Write an enzyme that holds these catalytic residues in place. Sequence first.
Site, PDB file in Angstrom:
ATOM      1  CD  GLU A 235       2.518  29.356  10.954  1.00  0.00           C
ATOM      2  OE1 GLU A 235       3.703  29.707  10.741  1.00  0.00           O
ATOM      3  OE2 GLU A 235       1.451  29.984  10.677  1.00  0.00           O
TER       4      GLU A 235
ATOM      5  CB  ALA B  22      -0.946   0.073   1.220  1.00  0.00           C
TER       6      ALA B  22
ATOM      7  CD  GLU C  45      -6.272  -6.019   5.996  1.00  0.00           C
ATOM      8  OE1 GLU C  45      -6.295  -6.725   4.878  1.00  0.00           O
ATOM      9  OE2 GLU C  45      -6.249  -4.765   5.981  1.00  0.00           O
TER      10      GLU C  45
HETATM   11  N1  LIG Z   1      -5.411   2.441  -0.536  1.00  0.00           N
HETATM   12  C1  LIG Z   1      -4.715   1.305  -0.735  1.00  0.00           C
HETATM   13  N2  LIG Z   1      -4.792   0.303   0.131  1.00  0.00           N
HETATM   14  C2  LIG Z   1      -3.997  -0.738  -0.226  1.00  0.00           C
HETATM   15  C3  LIG Z   1      -3.197  -0.853  -1.350  1.00  0.00           C
HETATM   16  N3  LIG Z   1      -2.494  -2.044  -1.330  1.00  0.00           N
HETATM   17  C4  LIG Z   1      -2.908  -2.649  -0.223  1.00  0.00           C
HETATM   18  N4  LIG Z   1      -3.814  -1.916   0.485  1.00  0.00           N
HETATM   19  C5  LIG Z   1      -4.451  -2.245   1.734  1.00  0.00           C
HETATM   20  O1  LIG Z   1      -3.438  -2.527   2.681  1.00  0.00           O
HETATM   21  C6  LIG Z   1      -3.870  -3.705   3.429  1.00  0.00           C
HETATM   22  C7  LIG Z   1      -3.003  -4.887   3.071  1.00  0.00           C
HETATM   23  O2  LIG Z   1      -1.603  -4.604   3.360  1.00  0.00           O
HETATM   24  P1  LIG Z   1      -0.545  -4.498   2.152  1.00  0.00           P
HETATM   25  O3  LIG Z   1       0.096  -3.157   2.244  1.00  0.00           O
HETATM   26  O4  LIG Z   1      -1.017  -5.160   0.922  1.00  0.00           O
HETATM   27  O5  LIG Z   1       0.583  -5.504   2.834  1.00  0.00           O
HETATM   28  P2  LIG Z   1       2.144  -5.404   3.029  1.00  0.00           P
HETATM   29  O6  LIG Z   1       2.484  -4.148   3.793  1.00  0.00           O
HETATM   30  O7  LIG Z   1       2.773  -5.533   1.711  1.00  0.00           O
HETATM   31  O8  LIG Z   1       2.376  -6.581   4.058  1.00  0.00           O
HETATM   32  P3  LIG Z   1       2.639  -8.177   3.693  1.00  0.00           P
HETATM   33  O9  LIG Z   1       2.236  -8.411   2.278  1.00  0.00           O
HETATM   34  O10 LIG Z   1       1.812  -8.905   4.603  1.00  0.00           O
HETATM   35  O11 LIG Z   1       4.113  -8.400   3.752  1.00  0.00           O
HETATM   36  C8  LIG Z   1      -5.372  -3.894   3.116  1.00  0.00           C
HETATM   37  O12 LIG Z   1      -6.113  -3.100   4.026  1.00  0.00           O
HETATM   38  C9  LIG Z   1      -5.396  -3.431   1.666  1.00  0.00           C
HETATM   39  O13 LIG Z   1      -6.631  -2.964   1.194  1.00  0.00           O
HETATM   40  C10 LIG Z   1      -3.093   0.244  -2.237  1.00  0.00           C
HETATM   41  O14 LIG Z   1      -2.330   0.387  -3.206  1.00  0.00           O
HETATM   42  N5  LIG Z   1      -3.878   1.311  -1.829  1.00  0.00           N
END
Ligand SMILES: Nc1nc2c(ncn2[C@@H]2O[C@H](COP(=O)(O)OP(=O)(O)OP(=O)(O)O)[C@@H](O)[C@H]2O)c(=O)[nH]1
Lengths: 429, 439, 57
Positions: free
Chosen positions: B253, B11, B182
């Site tokens: 600020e 993400a 989660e």
């Molecule tokens: N807004 C948004 N949410 C995302 C995206 N990719 C994943 N998520 C969210 O992030 C969560 C999943 O974690 P990710 O960031 O995919 O996992 P990671 O940090 O790569 O962790 P691991 O894969 O477990 O090693 C869920 O709530 C997903 O919907 C993205 O590009 N944008």
Amino acid sequence: REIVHIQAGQCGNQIGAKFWEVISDEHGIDPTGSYHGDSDLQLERINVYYNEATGNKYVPRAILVDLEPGTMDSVRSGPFGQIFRPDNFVFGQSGAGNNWAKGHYTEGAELVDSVLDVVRKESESCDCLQGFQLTHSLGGGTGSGMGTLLISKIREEYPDRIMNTFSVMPSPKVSDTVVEPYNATLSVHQLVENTDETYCIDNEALYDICFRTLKLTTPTYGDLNHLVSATMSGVTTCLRFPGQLNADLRKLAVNMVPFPRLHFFMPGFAPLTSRGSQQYRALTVPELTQQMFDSKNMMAACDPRHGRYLTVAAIFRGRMSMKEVDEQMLNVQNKNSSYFVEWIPNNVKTAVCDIPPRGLKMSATFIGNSTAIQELFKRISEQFTAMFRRKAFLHWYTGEGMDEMEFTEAESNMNDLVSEYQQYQDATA
Amino acid sequence: RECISIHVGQAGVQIGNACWELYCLEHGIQPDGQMPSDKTIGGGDDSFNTFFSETGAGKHVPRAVFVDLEPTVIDEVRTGTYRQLFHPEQLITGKEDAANNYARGHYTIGKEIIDLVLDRIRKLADQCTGLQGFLVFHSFGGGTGSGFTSLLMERLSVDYGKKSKLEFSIYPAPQVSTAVVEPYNSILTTHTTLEHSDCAFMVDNEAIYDICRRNLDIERPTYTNLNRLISQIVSSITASLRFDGALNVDLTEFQTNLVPYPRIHFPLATYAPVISAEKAYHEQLSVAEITNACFEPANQMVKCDPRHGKYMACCLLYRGDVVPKDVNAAIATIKTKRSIQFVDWCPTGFKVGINYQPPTVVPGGDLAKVQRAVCMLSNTTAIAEAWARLDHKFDLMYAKRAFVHWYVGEGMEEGEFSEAREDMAALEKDYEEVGVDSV
Amino acid sequence: IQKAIEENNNFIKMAKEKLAQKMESNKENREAHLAAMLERLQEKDKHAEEVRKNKEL
Ligand SMILES: Nc1nc2c(ncn2[C@@H]2O[C@H](COP(=O)(O)OP(=O)(O)OP(=O)(O)O)[C@@H](O)[C@H]2O)c(=O)[nH]1
Ligand SMILES: */C1=C\C(=O)C/C(C)=C\C=C\C(=O)O[C@H]([C@H](O)NC(=O)/C=C\C=C\C)C/C(C)=C/[C@@H]2COC[C@H](C1)O2
Ligand SMILES: Nc1nc2c(ncn2[C@@H]2O[C@H](COP(=O)(O)OP(=O)(O)OP(=O)(O)O)[C@@H](O)[C@H]2O)c(=O)[nH]1
Ligand SMILES: [Ca+2]
Ligand SMILES: [Mg+2]
Ligand SMILES: [Mg+2]
């Protein structure tokens, strides 16, 4: 992120060969190992199940094991038989005579070291091994006894890797071999302790689907295995094609296994409709959704409405509206609210993969961790007790050096698994 | 005054890609990193240099590190459109991810790459003449976004002391989540980072999803749709650091006003206008209109109801064709008409900044290009609703110890869970206490 | 100003220490989980010996 596949014994080799045929067709890999497909989706995660060789050949990361040569001779002559690595065939001459003790402690133990040699040669050239998948039956000797032996030895050498099985459970509708309950109970005793995830592929359910739903009046192993390989294709789509959900064995386990011993899944497939009823009922997302939650589409003979879901994975395949999938999945959950435990929120996850199975525009595959799986274990348990209380056929096992106590313990462990499912079924928020 | 961005896990990385692409367009930086309008080659002290370093060959390089425990998302940065913007060394991957398990990101897998990540961030810090701080982008829900981030923020408090650390944190929603666990990961990372973070902007995937569906008419939003909107909000917030102008008010600020006590450091962002090209056509949205829209709960980045809490601060960050006169008239209208109750110990005036650079959109996007936009940052007690929802999900599972064996197997203990959860209960209570009236 | 320095240094210190204690506790816990698993598995190899032995009689 490689998986190493092992198939053991007749059943294990028969359904394993079909698995390789089906997924090879889906990835555009021919019987010579050459890629001859259209779409880049097919090669993106090919390395999960296939090594690449010289000549742009793709070779299954697969090890074929039996205590007798017959089925492996058949495999080599089967379609796709020349795709396996020759050195990956490990077989004895003895046979195991439908005797778990022979597979696990005697003849199987004599061969297991040479199997491990090949497991290690495959593992050692993996960039980052995820784990292992085993296909076998629980009702014979080699898949059951030697397969569960292999699991424990692999777990010793790779204790932090995921162990997954596709485990075919016996039914008197398919085999009359009287000792099948003994071998299945002994095997489940092992699976409970040593696998992270087990797909319960129940021959009873495969028979009932073929006979009652598809109207095959005399189902063959070929018919049963056609369903198995379709299911296996479905439940591995997330590992084999790009995607977000359950994309590896460990992520799948973390989503599906809330308590370590409760790792026995009910798989399902949709659609399952006779050619005759197909003239009437359209193949649509609502139809798949309704079917995939119905007990008749389940590949373990258990009615989910007799228990509760801990966790579910729903995978749709083919071209279809994501919006419609989301709506139907919400709808089916709302209509079945009581059957999802309240104390695990958002416990049904949904993926969609663009590539449908061969000969369908769309399909769905279901993976349920339901407390109603207790029904399969209770069925085996009742056939086991009917024999064990008269000590029927015990001499075949005690003559390989086992004692009665190991049987009492395996029964007890399996009855405790049943009780644990019941406990989580009855638990409230 | 340089800011270093750190993008963690899927993400974090994918939101980073959208943010850096937008920043390049806002500044006239091409995908090879060239910027013809910049006449000082190889450095300078322009406002955009907070976020970009310069090489003597005229490349403008994000002050950024991308880190993920598996390679496949960062590999898309390495081979995609903006591949030449970044040095190879700023893009860091392991081979095996954290499997949606905080314990693996913080400990088992995380500990293997942490030293290398700290070594790369140091090479960025060393090129800065007055590093102001870090911006850290990550999910709550993933194992890396949760547990690797916590680890990194603890380590950064050790290596950079009290240097400021801000977060952009992606709060989970069911329509796009990938793990049942989660809630665990969210509460574990929130507890762990709380003392190490000076300010954190939560983005509720479900509020973004809903804005995409309702205001942009997208039937089933993807991450690409969510991330384009998210980057607009992020850009609004960082614009104060990357552009100059007499009416531009620095983010620090605003932060003075937003953070009354160290723990109470989670502003609610609301952004307008979010509108499609088809609706924006023959339609000018005035300062009054966009400002009004910032008090509509449906435009907020986190689902909660501010009308049922109290404000401790309200800041309006405008961009584009906006003059104070129109701002003042709009605020006065809103004061007479809206549900805006402050706690009794805080001044009730709105703080305003205006950056004149018009908003920009990425080609092939969903948002209309507009002449003026606004991001409201408020500190309201209602944001605790979001912690309450997550806390309840945690409680339902934890009472049965569901999935806890995955964490304990990676070396964690039950005490860490109950400690995290207790800290969250104390934070919920902090939010209640600050909104009670003085005796 | 000495107080400010002292509190900054004390925050760094306490953070460095908490993190070394967490990482050590984690390491030991995980290793003990592994060692318990391995010991269950070795108990099985031993039982398998005893079976093949019992057969020989
Ligand atoms: N807004 C948004 N949410 C995302 C995206 N990719 C994943 N998520 C969210 O992030 C969560 C999943 O974690 P990710 O960031 O995919 O996992 P990671 O940090 O790569 O962790 P691991 O894969 O477990 O090693 C869920 O709530 C997903 O919907 C993205 O590009 N944008
Ligand atoms: C196996 C093909 C094979 O050997 C026999 C052939 C040529 C077809 C078998 C089809 C079949 O079993 O179809 C099953 C359902 O009966 N079909 C439907 O219900 C279709 C529409 C329903 C509308 C309401 C579905 C299965 C089990 C198909 C599997 C998928 O994997 C490939 C495998 C090929 O068939
Ligand atoms: N679905 C399915 N079940 C099969 C197949 N072959 C055998 N079985 C089942 O498997 C069990 C018999 O075990 P096998 O796999 O034949 O035995 P094995 O592992 O070869 O062990 P030994 O023959 O004793 O050396 C019974 O329950 C059979 O119904 C098959 O191709 N498909
Ligand atoms: Ca310059
Ligand atoms: Mg047989
Ligand atoms: Mg990831």
